[PDB]
């Protein structure tokens, strides 16, 4: 279900973006295969090359980690009543 | 930007013909001893959104 086509900014990075936390709440929930399983199916881990996509995305991922706190905390036992 | 090496035969001047599938633009160019016909995927076929506000943008060759 790839979308097509990198470019800098689309919705083909939201989704990128969306398996990458689907991925990292896989590894939150300790399940490497699936997580991997996920980042195979965007790029190949047997790639050595410079991805600025890859890293922009990553970088994304974790800025978006930072300043949001994260799913299934005590921050939200107070957000929900 | 791609180059293409038809080392064979020169192309011919006016022999490169290019049409519209609703899938893919397919590319007909006519050389003095041979013919060639190529299939390049289509702009819509390779997704349409430019929603986000950029300056810069990937072709539809990768």
Same mark, same amino acid.
């Given at each position: 279900?790839?979308?097509?086509?990198?470019?800098?900014?689309? &919705?083909?990075?939201?989704?990128?973006?969306?398996?990458?936390?689907?991925?990292? $709440?896989?590894?939150?929930?300790?399940? &490497?295969?699936?997580?991997?399983?996920?980042?195979?199916?965007?790029?190949?881990?047997?790639?050595?090359? =410079?991805?600025?996509? $890859?890293?922009?995305?990553?970088?994304? &991922?974790?800025?978006? $980690? &930072?300043?949001?706190?994260?799913?299934?905390?005590?921050?939200?036992?107070?957000?929900? =009543? | 930007?791609? *180059?293409?090496? %038809?080392?064979?035969? +020169?192309?011919?001047?006016?022999?490169?013909? #290019?049409?519209?599938?609703?899938?893919?633009?397919?590319?007909?160019?006519?050389?003095?001893?041979?013919?060639? *016909?190529?299939?390049?995927?289509?702009? +819509? *076929?390779?997704? *349409? +959104?430019? #929603? %986000? +506000?950029?300056?810069? #943008?990937?072709? %539809?060759?990768?």
């Amino acid at each position: 279900a790839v979308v097509k086509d990198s470019r800098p900014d689309q &919705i083909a990075h939201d989704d990128k973006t969306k398996h990458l936390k689907a991925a990292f $709440l896989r590894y939150c929930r300790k399940d &490497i295969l699936g997580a991997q399983s996920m980042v195979d199916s965007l790029f190949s881990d047997s790639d050595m090359e =410079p991805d600025d996509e $890859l890293d922009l995305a990553v970088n994304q &991922i974790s800025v978006d $980690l &930072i300043d949001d706190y994260p799913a299934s905390d005590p921050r939200w036992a107070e957000s929900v =009543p | 930007a791609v *180059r293409l090496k %038809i080392l064979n035969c +020169s192309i011919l001047p006016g022999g490169v013909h #290019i049409c519209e599938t609703q899938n893919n633009i397919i590319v007909l160019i006519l050389t003095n001893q041979t013919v060639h *016909r190529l299939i390049l995927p289509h702009p +819509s *076929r390779m997704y *349409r +959104s430019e #929603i %986000i +506000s950029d300056s810069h #943008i990937q072709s %539809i060759f990768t």
